[PDB]
Design a protein around this nucleic acid. Structure first.
Ligand SMILES: Cc1cn([C@H]2C[C@H](O)[C@@H](COP(=O)(O)O)O2)c(=O)[nH]c1=O
Ligand SMILES: [Mn+2]
Ligand SMILES: [Mn+2]
Ligand SMILES: [Mn+2]
Length: 676
DNA sequence: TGAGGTAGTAGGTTGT
DNA sequence: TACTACCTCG
DNA sequence: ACAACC
């Protein structure tokens, strides 16, 4: 195709030695379990037995494969699972050769490779080993804490029969003191804490003045002798009474608690510039390679293609959405905005007034600025003021306020939403020279009033693009969809989300949401779209889009479905020259990496991994549209999002519905991006 | 609540 | 998934 | 348990 340069890149992967003739013929084992596992427990049981055997062994089909000879294995024993007891016996059955060309057998080989890496790393010193991560050096150290530097690794087997090493530098934050000693250093309370005696964590709420030897526990025991009776005080001291929270406040001891340290609990930048991350990636790869007898690492190369530069349009061409404030909007209607001040002051700050007037003047659209002379503490009278403002044509409200606590922020926003009013919060004190902050607030306000601040100018295969995501922080989730309608993406819409149990969006929900976007397109363009681009956040669960694809096909609407994965893309580095944006790296059929955003100061970019799950549009064209769609987001004035706009929008939508609840959205217009 | 991504920290679902 | 620190403003 | 995502 017509690319803007064919270049070569390094992946953080490394080619290593071919598997030797022993490794290609692992020892096979038949598994006998007594009692036989239930349907639910069979695979975890086989895996558990594989772990229990020792050496380097994994599950292979209904049986086992090992790179250790059975004479150093534990072939018989006893398992506990979910409160049961299984006797296991392993019967050696010789060795069967595995073909790397065959993806199943290659999968078994790769499981073995990973196990190999685990085991050989565990036998090392002196390095901190955690799973597939290795922390070698000490990056930083403070009173009672330290940050280790190392790398997260993976090891698998290519179809040519060789080892492949993945490496990505990582840091790990360690506390080495008890909650007692920790607070005994002047350090303030950690938000989260772990038991000293096992892995369970709690949310630390406050300290108590109570006596542990006198605090009754449900059941008769006191705190102190409860923990004593379990042998937890055998080797340490009780300390004070910490009140932690249930996953209902719960008593605990400061002597039996270890803070879990985050960045909030601690000048330490843990993001690396891409040159340094590349360099360390190599260092650690060669190190691993030499320590494990896996050969000299060969960095793998891939053909990359530079995508065309996106042309962002306001009233005229812009390089960033914030420019639409000086130049004018892509499409500006007659608008009314209202002001709500919670800081006891009066009227619109003059520079905000001037900026808004300037933008709308450049757009040639009229602007009315209202003021809410009411306050949330008035109760229902406040709601009546909101209603009246809505009746007078106010589309969204700017809230000037001191920083609000999360719950108050949520309550106020939800309340305004119930009167059909999206809100943009802007914190005071606010100086005129804090330009990025209040210009971004204004862009938020405007998208929330339903204006199109920018659009795309290019030509794309799909004239409707819709993103699907699931969100919410509870036992249930909201599945939702957002969309850009028209080839220019000159209309951004959300749809009413749906509650669901998990990550999978029900097939009927997927289709009903999609149909809503089709209908939005119909309302805008007076016709059905020729082709639609379906974007799924993360993986597509099996058959999730089946009904939707069937429905689209019945209507004669073409489609492409792309899984968009925010991790698993690894790292990409330039072979020569500077690292740039808009990088398309085709890996295998229907799969490719896309480097959508990057700034040097911002650390090392994490390229997206994309899978073309259905449709016949060429990979380059999809890469082109998704990359350009990344530039459509209106509410970020100075930095484009990594995700294409429909997904970024969908993510924010289901996040906000998760926070506020869906019950507030009935009177909010779907063109008003209330969640940005 | 200014925004973004990269970083860290905790956890979860899908599915073999 | 979702939180916060950091750094800077296509 | 484990993998590959969230
Ligand atoms: C046994 C028991 C413990 N607890 C609290 C005290 C311990 O600090 C906390 C955690 O105990 P655990 O780690 O054994 O689960 O549970 C109660 O609140 N009620 C009880 O009946
Ligand atoms: Mn998601
Ligand atoms: Mn999301
Ligand atoms: Mn916002």
């Amino acid at each position: 195709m017509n690319h803007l340069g064919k270049t070569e890149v390094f992946l953080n992967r490394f080619a290593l030695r071919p598997l030797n003739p022993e490794e290609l013929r692992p020892w096979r084992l038949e598994v006998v379990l007594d009692p036989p596992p239930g349907r639910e427990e069979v695979y975890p049981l086989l895996a558990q037995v594989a772990r229990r055997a020792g050496g380097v062994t994994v599950r292979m089909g209904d049986g086992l494969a090992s790179w250790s000879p059975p004479e150093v294995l534990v072939l018989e024993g006893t398992l506990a699972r979910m409160g049961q007891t299984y006797a296991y016996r392993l019967y050696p059955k010789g060795r069967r050769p595995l073909d790397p060309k065959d993806p199943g057998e290659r999968s078994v080989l790769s499981a073995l490779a990973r196990r190999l890496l685990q085991e050989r790393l565990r036998r090392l010193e002196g390095v901190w080993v955690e799973g597939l991560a290795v922390y070698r050096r000490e990056h930083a150290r403070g009173p009672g804490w330290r940050v280790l530097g190392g790398a997260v690794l993976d090891l698998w087997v290519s179809d040519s029969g060789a080892f492949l090493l993945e490496v990505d530098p990582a840091y790990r934050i360690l506390c080495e003191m008890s909650l007692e000693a920790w607070l005994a250093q002047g350090h303030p309370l950690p938000k989260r804490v772990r038991n000293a005696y096992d892995r369970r964590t709690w949310e630390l709420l406050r300290l108590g003045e109570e006596d542990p030897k006198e605090l009754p526990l449900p059941g008769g025991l006191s705190l102190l002798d409860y923990h004593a009776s379990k042998g937890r005080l055998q080797g340490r001291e009780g300390g004070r009474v910490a009140w932690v929270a249930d996953p209902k406040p719960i008593p605990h001891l400061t002597g039996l608690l270890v803070p879990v340290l985050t960045l909030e609990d601690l000048s330490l930048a843990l993001s690396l510039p891409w040159e340094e991350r590349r360099r360390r990636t190599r260092e650690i790869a060669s190190w691993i390679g030499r320590r494990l007898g896996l050969g000299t690492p060969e960095a793998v190369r891939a053909q990359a293609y530079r995508l065309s530069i996106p042309k962002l349009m306001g009233r005229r061409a812009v390089s960033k959405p914030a420019d639409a404030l000086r130049v004018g909007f892509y499409r500006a209607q007659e608008t009314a905005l209202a002001l709500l001040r919670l800081d006891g002051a009066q009227g619109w700050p003059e520079f905000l007034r001037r900026a808004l007037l300037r933008a709308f003047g450049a757009s040639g659209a009229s602007l009315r600025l209202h003021t809410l002379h009411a306050h949330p503490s008035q109760g229902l009278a406040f709601r009546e003021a909101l209603r009246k403002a809505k009746e007078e044509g106010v589309q969204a409200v700017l809230v000037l306020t001191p920083p609000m606590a999360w719950e108050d922020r949520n309550r106020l926003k939800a309340l305004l939403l119930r009167e059909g009013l999206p809100s943009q919060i802007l914190n005071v004190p606010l100086r005129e020279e804090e330009r990025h902050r209040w210009e971004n607030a204004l862009l938020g306000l405007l998208a929330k009033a339903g204006l199109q601040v920018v659009a795309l100018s290019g030509a794309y295969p799909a004239e409707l693009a819709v993103g699907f995501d699931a969100g919410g922080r509870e036992s249930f989730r909201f599945g939702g969809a957002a969309c850009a309608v028209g080839g220019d993406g000159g209309h951004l819409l959300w749809t009413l989300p749906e509650a669901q149990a998990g990550e999978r969006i029900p097939q009927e929900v997927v289709w009903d949401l999609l149909e809503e976007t089709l209908w939005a397109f119909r309302r805008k363009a007076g016709r059905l779209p020729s082709r639609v681009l379906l974007l799924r956040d993360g993986r597509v669960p099996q058959d999730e889009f089946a009904l939707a694809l069937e429905a689209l096909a019945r209507e004669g609407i073409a489609y492409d479905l792309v899984s968009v994965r925010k991790s698993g893309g690894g790292r990409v580095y330039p072979v020569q020259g500077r690292l740039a944006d808009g990088l398309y790296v085709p890996l295998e059929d229907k799969t490719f990496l896309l480097l959508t955003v990057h700034r040097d100061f911002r650390g090392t970019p994490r390229p997206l991994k994309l899978v073309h799950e259905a449709g016949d549009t060429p990979l380059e064209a999809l890469a082109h549209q998704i990359f350009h769609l990344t530039r459509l987001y209106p509410a970020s004035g100075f930095a484009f999002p990594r995700l294409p706009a429909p997904l970024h929008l969908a993510d924010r939508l289901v996040k906000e519905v998760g926070r506020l609840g869906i019950r507030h959205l009935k009177e909010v217009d779907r063109e008003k991006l209330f969640f940005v």
